[PDB]
């Protein structure tokens, strides 16, 4: 019980490092891909679709 209780600081630190690796990877992907993502999304959100729904 004593060994497990004192391991909260170590386990949380190891998990935080593991999550920080993936967080950095996600940020790196977003920083390079958001230009194209925004370029496509702005066209999607600006292009009209004038049509009637009778049929």
């Amino acid at each position: 019980e004593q060994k497990n209780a004192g391991g909260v600081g170590e386990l949380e630190k190891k998990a935080e490092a593991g999550v920080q690796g993936e967080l950095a990877e996600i940020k790196k992907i977003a920083e390079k891909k958001k230009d194209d993502v925004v370029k496509i999304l702005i066209e999607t959100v600006i292009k009209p679709s004038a049509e009637v729904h009778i049929n």
Partner: peptide, 11 residues
């Protein structure tokens, strides 16, 4: 394989 069909806005 692409689901790019979703990039359309329907008000």
């Amino acid at each position: 394989k692409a689901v790019e069909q979703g990039f359309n806005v329907k008000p």
